[PDB]
């Protein structure tokens, strides 16, 4: 009880927000959730395997791609086992496991040791086939030797968890719901007339709307009006958001209040809600009141209480085939609902079905629940992630509807959970209530696997550190996680948090003071002062928790000559068993919002996985990136890489030959050089298709880079998000491919061919990409997120069009880029002057 004060204070340090704080609330939902999440934590902690949790092996049940089979020699796998600076090689089959492989070593010169990967904290352990380990595939994909160091396993005791110590409406009537608007109050006015618009909302649909009369916008406006709504109290659905907004027209302020609380009670009493200052985005839905009580506006209220016909089946099937953004007419909705039992047979009909429910009626919602009660077809259906994701977006409130979504995610293996985790963390923003099946899914999955747990922490910490709209909720979830992750990890997270808090301090202090002599001088002094006392011996790399970064390579650290002034920092590896002498690189940056970088890079990983399922590898580089705080964070330095603008600038006269010449120098042999040119054709093709689909194609060439081995890759997506070519394919790139102006070439034929395959590949997962894009814009990018902005990707994916018309579309977009040529790239420098 005296010791728990320090532990709670330790948890507040890791979260960067006090969950015991009660200044910004009008109920106990957050405290109820803190208590509510105890059971799921303690359940999952009680059921987890200690040794497997300790070693967390990164394995899969998905097949090896048709591309990766060619790198197997003679059904053989060369593992290089190390032990005390003395190595040995072993012949291994693809279906072998570590236990069989260890017994082979002991024969050639028992069950105490474990086979750990060289460089990383990663363990080839368990009863998984050696073909289906992620690390075995990294070494096959990159073309590397599978190196592993024999040593003792990590002791489970280190991962000990601390001991802990702790339907319908009530007041139900056929009365019409009403709220008295007493008045509003702000200390300073920021536009002479104003009025309150009150809205009964369920899942971003206005069930009923009433307004006050207009009045002069003075510092204290008092209407004292009862607004009677049409909707009856018994007809209020759970999760019904009372949304209050101030207009002048122009929406200036907004706040929300849940009409039915976490204990199923109707909301009643005097409330003084502090509002947010200002098209739909996730912030607009929040149950959170404004914490800035001094400067913010406040509203004050009072609550006192047979077989189907042929044509129609075909008509219904037509509705079910359409894209997620395809509008349902009131005719369509009436059809879907009337034949809801037929609609229930088709899992793909579900989003549209539950979008056809009149959530303003108790009889209907009752019927909808009776319908969901018999879901044999839903449970037996093969997991569709895109379908599951629809049902967790802003259009669906209602626990049961969202619950069957989460029910399908349960089947995802750990590998697939990481792929979708960020989006799923963001989807918590669309939850009406703090405690939710989704929140509990995340917590559970985080506690079961350290890798998922690691990235959960940081994704949660990102939003806690900068979203006032949702910091309160996410913190109660992260506190819940950290209370079961283990003492080993809590110490590990603390190390990382303390390293980051140092390194951001140097970044911002140097940002205050193009490059000069004193800036180069002061940095090398600043990094020495931290390394000599403050900074640890070693710490986990947040963007990659296999790597333990050691000391600073102070020689290699430097500041960019840019307005934003990022810190390029470089670390030696703390692991002595690491194969090379190569450094772990990091870019700390203030000024950009790196949550936009996060979300784009995460879709690129999803695009790779899609491409893997249809045996394609377009050679993307989705480097590590983690947002740590407000306009601040961290990026993985991609090694042996330059910007294509530096290659050129060595005014604004761009040159066709130079990139091709640049590859000839950094690659010694021709067969390497051609291998670079090959890698360029894929990488360039993949980044063209991906950026077209995401609407972020038109980049200026400072924000496009290439590796010495010809791997093209884009950067700085946060910069862009906030005459026009569809994607960067400047002449310099085409010159590597052996074509100039009108001409064609054998690599350029291969470019168009892959681009077409990839594009059509992504189009086989249209719905998934539509929702990822939809949810990105709503949760990630406040700047632009209207109906038309979401509907960009429809036109990009050529929805409702066959593979021939679609092929023609993308090839024409390639022809545009050439027809304009250097035009746009030159126009950036021209715009700096103009
Ligand atoms: C532009 C370049 C760069 O960025 C610095 O910060 C920097 C700092 C001190 C000196 C040179 C630099 C350079 C640099 C410029 C020209 C040639 C070589 C290096 N850059 N930028 C990102 C990068 C990517 C993001 O998504 C977000 C972000 F904020 C930065 C990046 C990366 N991930 N990997 C490798 N290089 C990278």
Swiss-Prot record:
Residue intervals of the PI3K-RBD domain: 74-152
- Hey, what tissues is this thing expressed in? Pancreas, skeletal muscle, liver and heart.
**GO biological process entries:** adaptive immune response; angiogenesis; cell migration; cellular response to cAMP; dendritic cell chemotaxis; endocytosis; G protein-coupled receptor signaling pathway; hepatocyte apoptotic process
- Name of a matching Pfam family: PI3K_C2
| Any GO MF annotation of the entry | ATP binding
Concerning SUPFAM superfamilies, the annotation shows: ARM repeat (SSF48371), C2 domain (Calcium/lipid-binding domain, CaLB) (SSF49562), Protein kinase-like (PK-like) (SSF56112), Ubiquitin-like (SSF54236)
**TM ranges:** none
Where Phosphothreonine occurs along the chain?
Answer: 766
**Which PROSITE patterns is this protein grouped with?**
C2_PI3K, PI3_4_KINASE_1, PI3_4_KINASE_2, PI3_4_KINASE_3, PI3K_ABD, PI3K_RBD, PIK_HELICAL
- Per the record's keyword annotation, is Transcription included, yes or no? no
Q: Which InterPro entries match?
A: ARM-type_fold, C2_domain_sf, Kinase-like_dom_sf, PI3/4_kinase_cat_dom, PI3/4_kinase_cat_sf, PI3/4_kinase_CS, PI3K-type_C2_dom, PI3K_ABD
Task: Name the Enzyme Commission number(s) assigned to this protein.
Answer: 2.7.1.137, 2.7.1.153, 2.7.1.154, 2.7.11.1
UniProt family annotation? Belongs to the PI3/PI4-kinase family.
Cited function = Phosphoinositide-3-kinase (PI3K) that phosphorylates PtdIns(4,5)P2 (Phosphatidylinositol 4,5-bisphosphate) to generate phosphatidylinositol 3,4,5-trisphosphate (PIP3). PIP3 plays a key role by recruiting PH domain-containing proteins to the membrane, including AKT1 and PDPK1, activating signaling cascades involved in cell growth, survival, proliferation, motility and morphology. Links G-protein coupled receptor activation to PIP3 production. Involved in immune, inflammatory and allergic responses. Modulates leukocyte chemotaxis to inflammatory sites and in response to chemoattractant agents.
Report what the protein is called. Phosphatidylinositol 4,5-bisphosphate 3-kinase catalytic subunit gamma isoform
Q: Which gene encodes it?
A: PIK3CG
């Amino acid at each position: 009880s005296e010791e728990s004060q320090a532990f709670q204070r330790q948890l507040t340090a890791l979260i960067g927000y006090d969950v015991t704080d009660v200044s910004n609330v009008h109920d106990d939902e957050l405290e109820f959730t803190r208590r509510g999440l105890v059971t799921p934590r303690m359940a999952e902690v009680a059921s987890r395997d200690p040794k497997l949790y300790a070693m967390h092996p990164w394995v899969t049940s998905k097949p090896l791609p048709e591309y990766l089979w060619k790198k197997i020699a003679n059904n053989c796998i060369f593992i290089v086992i190390h032990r005390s600076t003395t190595s040995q090689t072993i012949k291994v089959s693809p279906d072998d496991t570590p236990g069989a492989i260890l017994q082979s070593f002991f024969t050639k010169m028992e069950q105490d040791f474990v086979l750990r990967v060289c460089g990383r904290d990663e363990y080839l352990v368990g009863e998984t086939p050696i073909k289906n380990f992620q690390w075995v595939r990294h070494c096959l994909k990159n073309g590397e030797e599978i190196h592993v160091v024999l040593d003792t396993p990590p002791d489970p005791a280190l991962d000990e968890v601390r001991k802990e110590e702790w339907t319908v409406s009530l007041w139900d009537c056929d009365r019409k719901f009403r709220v008295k608007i007493r008045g509003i109050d702000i200390p300073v006015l920021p536009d002479l007339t104003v009025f309150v618009e009150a809205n009964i909302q369920h899942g971003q649909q206005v069930l009923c709307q009433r307004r006050t009369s207009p009045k002069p916008f003075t510092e204290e406006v008092l209407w004292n009006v009862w607004l009677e709504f049409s909707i009856k109290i018994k007809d209020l659905p759970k999760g019904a958001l009372l949304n209050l907004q101030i207009y002048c027209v122009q929406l200036l302020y907004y706040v929300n209040l849940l009409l039915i609380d976490h204990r199923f009670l109707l909301r009643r009493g005097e409330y003084v809600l502090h509002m947010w200052q200002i098209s739909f985005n996730a912030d607009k839905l929040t149950s959170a009141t404004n914490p800035d009580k001094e400067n913010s506006m406040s509203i004050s209220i009072l609550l006192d209480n047979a077989e189907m016909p042929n044509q129609l089946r075909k008509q219904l099937e037509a509705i079910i085939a359409t894209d997620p953004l395809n509008p349902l007419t009131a005719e369509d909705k009436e059809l879907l609902w009337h034949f809801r039992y037929e609609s229930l047979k088709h899992p793909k009909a579900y989003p549209k079905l539950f979008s056809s429910v009149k959530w303003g009626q108790q009889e209907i919602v009752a019927k909808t629940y009776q319908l969901l009660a018999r879901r044999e077809v839903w449970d037996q259906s093969a997991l569709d992630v895109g379908l599951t994701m629809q049902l967790l977006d802003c259009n669906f409130s209602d626990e049961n509807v969202r619950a069957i979504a989460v029910q399908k995610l349960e089947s995802l293996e750990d590998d697939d959970v990481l792929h979708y985790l960020l989006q799923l963390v963001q989807a918590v923003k669309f939850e009406p209530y703090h405690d939710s099946a989704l929140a509990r899914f995340l917590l559970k999955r985080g506690l079961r696997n350290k890798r998922i747990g690691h990235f959960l922490f940081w994704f949660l910490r990102s939003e806690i550190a900068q979203s006032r709209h949702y910091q309160q909720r996410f913190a109660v979830i992260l506190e819940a996680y950290l209370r079961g992750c283990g003492t080993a990890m809590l110490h590990d997270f603390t190390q990382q948090v303390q390293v980051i808090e140092m390194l951001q301090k140097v970044t911002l202090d140097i940002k205050s003071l193009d490059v000069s002599s004193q800036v180069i001088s002061q940095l090398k002094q600043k990094l020495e002062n931290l390394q000599n006392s403050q900074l640890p011996e070693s710490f986990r790399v947040p963007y990659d928790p296999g790597l333990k970064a050691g000391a600073l390579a102070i020689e290699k650290c430097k500041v960019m000559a840019s307005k934003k002034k990022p810190l390029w920092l470089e670390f030696k590896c703390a692991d002595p068993t690491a194969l090379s002498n190569e450094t772990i690189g990091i870019i700390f940056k203030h000024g950009d919002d790196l949550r936009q970088d996060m979300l784009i890079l995460q879709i690129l990983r999803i695009m790779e996985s899609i491409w893997e399922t249809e045996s394609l590898d377009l050679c993307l580089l989705p480097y590590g990136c983690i947002s740590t705080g407000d306009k601040i964070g961290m990026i993985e330095i991609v090694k042996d890489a330059t910007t294509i603008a530096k290659i050129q600038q060595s005014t604004g006269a761009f040159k066709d030959e130079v990139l091709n010449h640049w590859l000839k120098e950094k690659s010694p042999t021709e067969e390497k050089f051609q291998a670079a040119v090959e890698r360029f054709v894929y990488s360039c093709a993949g980044y063209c298709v991906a950026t077209f689909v995401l609407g972020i194609g038109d980049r200026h060439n400072d924000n496009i880079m290439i590796t010495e081995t010809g791997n093209l890759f884009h950067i700085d997506f946060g910069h862009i998000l906030g005459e026009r070519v569809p994607f960067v394919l400047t002449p310099d790139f085409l010159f590597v491919m052996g074509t100039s102006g009108k001409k064609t070439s054998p690599h350029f034929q291969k470019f168009q061919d892959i681009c077409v395959k990839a594009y059509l590949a992504l189009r086989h997962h249209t719905n998934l990409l539509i929702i990822l894009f939809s949810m990105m814009l709503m949760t990630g990018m406040p700047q632009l997120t209207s109906k038309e902005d979401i509907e960009y990707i429809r036109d990009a994916l050529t929805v409702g069009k066959n593979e021939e018309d679609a092929k023609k579309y993308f090839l024409d977009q390639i022809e545009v880029c050439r027809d304009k040529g250097w035009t746009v790239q030159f126009n950036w420098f021209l715009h700096l002057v103009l």
